[PDB]
Design a protein around this nucleic acid. Structure first.
Ligand SMILES: [Zn+2]
Lengths: 509, 178, 417
RNA sequence: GUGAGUAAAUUUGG
RNA sequence: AAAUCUUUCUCAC
């Protein structure tokens, strides 16, 4: 049916693929591709472009954001029981805490300063040294990549050591700053539509467009290229250490360590990889492996191909095409004048995940579609009515409801089929407010959140004064004192636990 | 003495790390959303409770009526800018007993960019989803340190040269810099 | 005590009074303000609170007594202090950004930089590699798509029946007959019976993929929504016959036969065998008490079942129909047939897309979108984007890929672009 | 490697 | 047995 669409359709209506296939095969093939590229027989991994038009941020203070150093994402922790390296998977928060415990350090900034300040690689920084840190930071673990539409085969992501993550965070922050400075496209966070509009404006002055993709992007960005870019932007010893760890990286597949000297593992240094091409030439609008450019004559196209080759941005011959009447970037398709291309485009269907979550999500999707030119409003209203009918067929059993109120949705025992326009313009019973995309959370969302939320934990450090930074050092006594002071102040007001604060109600009055 | 085990070997840790160690991880349920909602009639009980108790206390909102003629145009990014709170009212809100985390979140400005291809004569901003129909949206740096009496602090005089004092007109500690 | 903070201390307390006129903070770096006859325990002394204040850079602790209050100046122009008051004073006072020596900079060079660079140099480096010769030609034509479809068909062939895809049509039996047939089929396969439920026990695996072939298209899929809802219900209700308005299925857990002490209940990872009924007249016919029906099985992964059971067939069909061209009639093998073909078979194709958990049709659709938007493509390379057989394995995904290619061929044949 | 039992997915979706 | 290294429950020693 996607083949018989009048306009552009990516076939995103159904959910993405699923699989529990182990990631060992994907990682093994990725490492084999990297090894093949290293021997210079498949693609190019040697950077030749001149990265001289890049500002040198050598004097910029080393800025570390601690928010991204702690998270629930998985990471690899390395131990040396009897001289043999053992790799375990643990939350990034636990990994960072273990790293800080091994080398006594109040915060990651102190660890970075100590690492950069020692006078030798064997000097102790606690129960470790820079040599040991570098040796342990080259170990990675394989995991299954998140499923995405259009990729039936499972892909592999790689979890790194906390030290590697810290250095990567620093270099990536500075590389993103340089990228934002070099061009206005990467201001802070450009969505697909914003990038598409900017590209349409940029490439309007030429005839042909070169909607293109880079193949084997992660396997072709060598440690040499990363070090070259980092030196160009002035990364100092941090860049050298990171390049050394990348060159010596080892991946634990199943139960064996395999060497992968070639390329990088996954999209870790996206900013640096983009900066390679961007500093090579001001002719492309590239976001990692996705780029777009325009040309007028075959000689210009040959120059573009040579520029891409010299920047280790090997063109993907399978899914790169030349267009004259359309532009395409990050799945967003636009007309040369800037208008969104007619058709469904990237519209995605809403799977059944609850009586009211489904309605809220389909309402949000239809609002997004109608706000653009995807479909007229009447079509969206008909689709909303159809979805309400489907939800009624699916959720109108006693196991979900025992009510027969007139105002209730047909799927919860009622006999109300709210018009899409009536729902959007707050013209319904208050029970329907939760179904509005901007309305409060639905009953299903709260129930599922409670289910998810249902260890010898520490003393909770919530309800903090907004004026205290999160980088302040606190001991056990400090936490207890803060809790006691907050409780005493709340009691002085004759009040229980603090009342929830919502910005909308505060602005209303 | 969990502090001595989670942070073994360190007596002081940053607030970020300590809070990261109290996130209360959420476990990925192995069942679908439908089966989870059916389990123990949790959703049915929640719906009964909401209808009986929560629904009557809902602050009924007004219905949108303002409309303007619109015509299809190029794709644009409609920008909604919600300002964040400032130090003064943030301190006041925290002192009054509101949750500190919520106020901390509200101190950050919010920017919403929405792709819309629809324009009006006056270039009005439209509501969520209602773009086709045309529903429109329309010296001394005295600093308040706190709204409480800190013990053993000098009272604010007529001409506070540069110190920190207490104000009687407004129940707050004032820092008079410069 | 460090001499790099002297100036920083001076600006920290310009003219700040504490009692009536006297300056609140005494700077230890100035003799006139320094307190004689007492050991110095910090950068500055506060007389109201009788405390010592020390300034440190980010991650650079100084040697001062624990009693001394430390005010950290972060690299992002943000200050921290255990005492809110001193934090505010420093925040307002240090607006004039004055760089302090010792601040760590991203360009910092460690004493081991040369050694690490030498180690990197001694390590292996990549070779250049060949420059591709790119030829830009017109996109593939109908002939190339027909060639790809014919290659797939001759390489894999067709099944005699539609297998589980026939379960989207009525089997011609009532609820009682359907339940009896399913239960008697489960008994015939010698499935274990326990706690009123069926369990399929296995001991050894051949460790080879099952035979792959293309499924012929049934005439229509009237019971697509019913079947998908039944699978969604069976995600957890396994071992007993599930009934719908017009059809039934039986999802039996697949468990290892360890021995006398064996697994007795399903767990999160336990696979299912979904057994469904369709009209008889194929190899998989089953008869009991005069009731005859074709019994077709599908081995489903729990993630596969969860993904399949959540699809919205009707809404997807309507969204596709919003801006669709005229769908032609097609034959059992996805070939244009204006004489005896049926337009309802397209519904079946959609149902197949819902049943295929790898969604290779999504990849085919993305490539076809590129094809329709392309003026020129790389010769002999773009055409190798519809060859997705290596990316998938199984009868259902193979059939889905074949019929996606057939849909592309039909679009090019009937509505050329 | 040996032995034994059989909290969690059925309760409750036409 | 199948969309085939997946269908791998608990306890004690
Ligand atoms: Zn058959």
């Amino acid at each position: 049916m996607w083949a018989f669409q009048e306009g552009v359709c990516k076939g995103n209506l159904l959910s993405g693929p699923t699989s529990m296939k182990a990631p060992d095969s994907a990682a093994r093939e990725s490492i084999d591709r990297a090894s093949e590229i290293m021997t210079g027989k498949s693609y190019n991994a040697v950077h030749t472009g001149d990265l001289s038009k890049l500002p040198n941020q050598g004097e910029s203070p080393l800025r570390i954001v601690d928010s991204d150093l702690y998270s629930e994402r998985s990471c690899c922790w390395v131990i040396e029981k009897e001289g043999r390296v053992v790799c375990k998977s643990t939350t990034l928060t636990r990994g960072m805490t273990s790293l800080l415990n091994t080398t006594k350090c109040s915060s990651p900034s102190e660890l970075i300063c100590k690492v950069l300040t020692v006078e030798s690689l064997s000097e102790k920084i606690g129960d470790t040294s820079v040599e040991e840190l570098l040796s342990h930071g080259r170990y990675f673990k394989c995991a299954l990549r998140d499923q995405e539409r259009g990729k039936p085969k499972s892909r592999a992501i790689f979890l790194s050591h906390p030290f590697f993550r810290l250095l990567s965070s620093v270099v990536e922050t500075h590389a993103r700053s340089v990228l934002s400075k070099v061009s206005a496209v990467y201001t802070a966070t450009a969505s697909a539509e914003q990038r598409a509009m900017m590209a349409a404006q940029v490439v309007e002055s030429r005839k042909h467009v070169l909607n293109g993709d880079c193949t084997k992007y992660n396997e072709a960005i060598d440690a040499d290229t990363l070090l070259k870019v980092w030196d160009a932007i002035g990364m100092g010893s941090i860049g050298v250490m990171l390049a050394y760890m990348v060159r010596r990286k080892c991946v634990l597949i199943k139960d064996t360590l395999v060497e992968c000297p070639g390329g990088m593992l996954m999209g870790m240094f996206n900013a640096t990889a983009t900066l390679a091409l961007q500093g090579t030439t001001d002719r492309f609008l590239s976001f990692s492996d996705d780029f777009i450019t325009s040309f007028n004559s075959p000689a210009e196209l040959r120059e573009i191909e040579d520029l891409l080759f010299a920047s280790c941005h090997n063109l993907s011959l399978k899914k790169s095409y030349i267009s004259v009447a359309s532009l395409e970037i990050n799945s967003c398709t636009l007309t040369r004048d800037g208008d969104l291309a007619t058709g469904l485009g990237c519209t995605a269907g809403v799977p059944f995940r609850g009586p009211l979550v489904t309605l809220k999500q389909t309402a949000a999707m239809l609002s997004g579609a109608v706000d653009s030119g995807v479909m007229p409003f009447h079509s969206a209203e008909r689709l909303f009515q159809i979805k309400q009918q489907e939800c009624a067929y699916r959720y109108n059993n006693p196991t979900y409801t025992t009510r027969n109120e007139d105002f209730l949705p047909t799927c919860l025992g009622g006999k109300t089929v709210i018009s899409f326009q009536s729902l959007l313009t707050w013209d319904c019973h208050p029970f329907w407010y939760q179904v509005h995309p901007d309305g409060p959370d639905t009953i299903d969302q709260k129930v599922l959140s409670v289910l998810a939320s249902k260890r010898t934990r520490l003393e909770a450090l919530s309800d903090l004064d907004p004026l205290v930074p999160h980088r302040l050092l606190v001991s056990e006594s400090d936490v207890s004192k803060i809790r006691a002071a907050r409780q005493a102040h709340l009691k002085s007001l004759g009040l229980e636990q603090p009342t929830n604060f919502n910005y909308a109600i505060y602005k209303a009055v | 003495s969990q502090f001595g085990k989670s942070f073994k070997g360190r007596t002081e840790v940053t607030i970020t790390e300590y809070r990261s160690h109290t996130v209360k991880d959420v476990h990925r349920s192995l069942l679908t959303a439908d089966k989870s909602l059916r389990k123990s009639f949790c959703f049915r009980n929640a719906l009964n409770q909401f209808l009986d108790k929560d629904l009557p206390l809902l602050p009924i909102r007004p219905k949108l009526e303002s409309r303007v003629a619109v015509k299809k145009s190029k794709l644009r990014s409609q920008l909604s800018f919600r300002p964040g709170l400032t130090q003064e009212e943030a301190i006041d809100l925290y002192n009054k007993g509101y949750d500190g985390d919520s106020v901390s979140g509200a101190l950050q400005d919010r920017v919403v960019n929405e792709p819309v291809a629809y324009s009006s004569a006056d270039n009005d901003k439209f509501h969520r989803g209602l773009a086709a129909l045309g529903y429109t949206l329309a010296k001394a740096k005295v600093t308040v340190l706190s709204r409480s009496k800190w013990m053993g602090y000098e009272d604010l005089p007529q001409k506070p040269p540069n110190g920190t004092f207490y104000c009687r007109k407004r129940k707050a500690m004032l820092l008079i810099s410069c | 005590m460090d001499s790099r903070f002297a100036q920083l201390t001076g600006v920290f307390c310009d003219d700040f009074t504490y009692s009536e006129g006297s300056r609140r903070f005494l700077s230890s770096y100035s003799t006139v303000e320094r307190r004689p006859g007492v050991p110095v325990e910090g950068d500055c002394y506060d007389c109201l609170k009788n405390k010592w204040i020390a300034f440190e850079l980010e991650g650079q602790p100084r040697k001062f007594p624990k009693a001394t209050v430390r005010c950290i100046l972060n690299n992002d122009a943000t200050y921290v202090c255990s005492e809110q008051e001193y934090q505010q004073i420093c925040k307002v006072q240090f607006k004039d950004y004055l760089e302090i020596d010792g601040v760590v900079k991203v360009g910092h060079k460690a004493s081991y930089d040369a050694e690490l660079r030498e180690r990197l140099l001694e390590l292996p480096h990549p070779k250049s590699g060949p420059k591709p010769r790119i030829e830009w030609v017109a996109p593939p034509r109908l002939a190339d798509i027909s060639k790809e479809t014919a290659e797939l068909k001759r390489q894999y062939g067709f099944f005699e029946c539609s297998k589980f895809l026939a379960c989207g049509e009525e089997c011609g039996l009532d609820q009682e007959a359907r339940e009896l047939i399913l239960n008697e089929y489960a008994r015939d396969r010698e499935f274990e019976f326990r706690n009123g439920g069926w369990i399929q026990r296995y001991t050894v695996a051949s460790h080879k993929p099952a035979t792959q072939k293309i499924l012929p298209l049934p005439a229509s899929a009237p019971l697509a929504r019913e079947l998908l809802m039944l699978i969604a219900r069976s995600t957890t209700q396994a071992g007993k016959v599930l009934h719908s308005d017009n059809t039934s299925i039986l999802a039996v857990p697949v468990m290892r036969d360890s021995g006398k002490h064996s697994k007795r209940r399903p767990t999160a990872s336990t696979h299912h065998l979904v057994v469904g009924l369709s009209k008889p007249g194929c190899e998989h016919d089953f008869e009991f008490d005069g009731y005859r029906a074709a019994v077709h099985v599908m081995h489903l992964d729990p993630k596969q079942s969860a993904n399949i059971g959540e699809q919205d067939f009707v809404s997807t069909r309507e969204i596709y129909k919003l801006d669709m061209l005229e769908l032609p009639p097609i034959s059992r093998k996805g070939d244009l047939d204006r004489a005896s073909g049926l337009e309802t078979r397209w519904d079946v194709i959609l149902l197949l897309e819902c049943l295929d958990s790898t969604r290779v049709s999504q990849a085919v659709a993305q490539h076809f979108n590129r094809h329709r938007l392309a003026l020129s493509v790389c010769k002999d390379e773009f055409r190798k984007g519809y060859q997705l057989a290596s990316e998938i394995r199984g009868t259902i995904p193979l059939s889905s890929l074949y019929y996606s290619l057939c849909a592309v061929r039909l679009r090019m044949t009937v509505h050329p672009f």
